[PDB]
């Protein structure tokens, strides 16, 4: 189903994204202020907003 | 200290907001609420300062 990216599985994808905490850590991070947590939003792009 | 201090763009935004001068359209009238004050400048029948 995901082999064809069925619109169905995207709604299942939704279910596993709605309130799923995410951790964001940059590379040039030397101090702890480069690590936080957020909430996902479906973005049609290549870069992490 | 709440580490995140408005850097530059956002600072200027609020800086051009809260600011005073001598010449401005409507300078002198009275309003019973900042709510209609909102609907006063979004229309633009008076100056922001």
């Amino acid at each position: 189903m995901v082999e064809r990216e069925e619109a169905v599985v995207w709604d299942i994808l939704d279910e596993v994204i709605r309130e799923h905490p995410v951790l964001l850590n940059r590379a040039p991070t030397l101090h702890r202020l480069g690590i936080q947590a957020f909430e996902p939003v479906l973005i049609e792009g290549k870069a992490i907003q | 200290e709440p580490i995140i201090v408005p850097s530059q763009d956002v600072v200027l935004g609020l800086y051009y907001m809260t600011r005073d001068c001598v010449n401005a359209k409507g300078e002198g009238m009275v309003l019973t609420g900042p709510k209609e004050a909102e609907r006063l400048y979004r229309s633009g029948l008076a100056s922001l300062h």
């Binding site: - | 850097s7 530059q8 763009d9 200027l12 935004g13």
Partner: protein, 248 residues
């Protein structure tokens, strides 16, 4: 080209070797794309087998950065030149003149966070006209023709697939002359022998019956790089030093 430069635009074209220059003047006779046939004026036309010059242009090739380079014909048909003028355009050049990018109507106004210090805001008109686009023609090396384990052949015996993959793999088992390869297809077929220790006794006997090479030669071809979707334009082949290939 930059409208407001300093006057060294043609100076880049002349002091660089990205544009095909003329060593003699004269009416161009047959300009196509990969060739520019020139007729030279007699005042500077050699008394040695007359004088018809030629300039060959690189047509959509690769570079170090694997970026595309194409000498674009700036001279049309029936147009004379001077001993020191241009015939082609290297990458990022306009009439020889150094033309790096393009100039637009730039403005400086704060506007809904799309410009925070480094953040830039551009009109969709750019990619709607496709003015700023690049071409990445890439080269991937392939090996074949005798690995000590067994003399290799290109494609020949190709298992693990049907005939769907061969729709673009001709009578040589090589990729088409302009295919749309994507995801995980195969570029060129590469065959390689297997091994002694791994053959089972129930396939050593059946091995010495159904041919000379039953379950020995496998499919270990060079495949389309995982994660790319492009178009094969040119094939650079090198036949065995001494013995030719087969047909392609």
């Amino acid at each position: 080209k930059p409208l407001v430069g300093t006057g060294m635009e043609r100076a880049v074209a002349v002091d660089s070797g990205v544009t095909a220059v003329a060593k003699r003047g004269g009416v161009v006779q047959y300009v196509d794309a990969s060739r520019i046939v020139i007729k030279v004026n007699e005042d500077e036309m050699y008394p040695g087998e007359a004088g018809i010059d030629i300039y060959n242009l690189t047509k959509y090739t690769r570079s170090n950065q694997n970026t595309c380079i194409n000498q674009m014909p700036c001279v049309s048909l029936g147009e004379p030149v001077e001993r020191g003028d241009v015939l082609a355009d290297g990458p990022s050049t306009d009439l020889g003149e150094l033309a790096l990018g393009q100039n637009m109507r730039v403005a400086f106004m704060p506007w809904n966070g799309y410009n925070f210090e480094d953040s830039i805001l551009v009109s969709e008109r750019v990619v709607q006209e496709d003015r700023f686009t690049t071409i990445h023609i890439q080269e991937l090396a392939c090996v074949s023709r005798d690995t000590k384990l067994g003399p290799e052949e290109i494609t020949a015996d190709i298992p693990n697939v049907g005939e769907a993959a061969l729709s673009k793999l001709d009578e040589s088992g090589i990729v088409y002359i302009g295919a749309e390869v994507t995801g995980g297809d195969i570029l060129v077929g590469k065959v390689t022998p297997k091994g002694e220790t791994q053959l089972t006794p129930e396939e050593k006997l059946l091995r010495a019956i159904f041919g000379e090479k039953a379950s020995d030669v496998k499919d270990s071809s060079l495949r389309v790089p995982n994660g790319v979707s492009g178009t094969v334009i040119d094939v650079q082949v090198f036949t065995r030093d001494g013995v030719e290939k087969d047909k392609r």
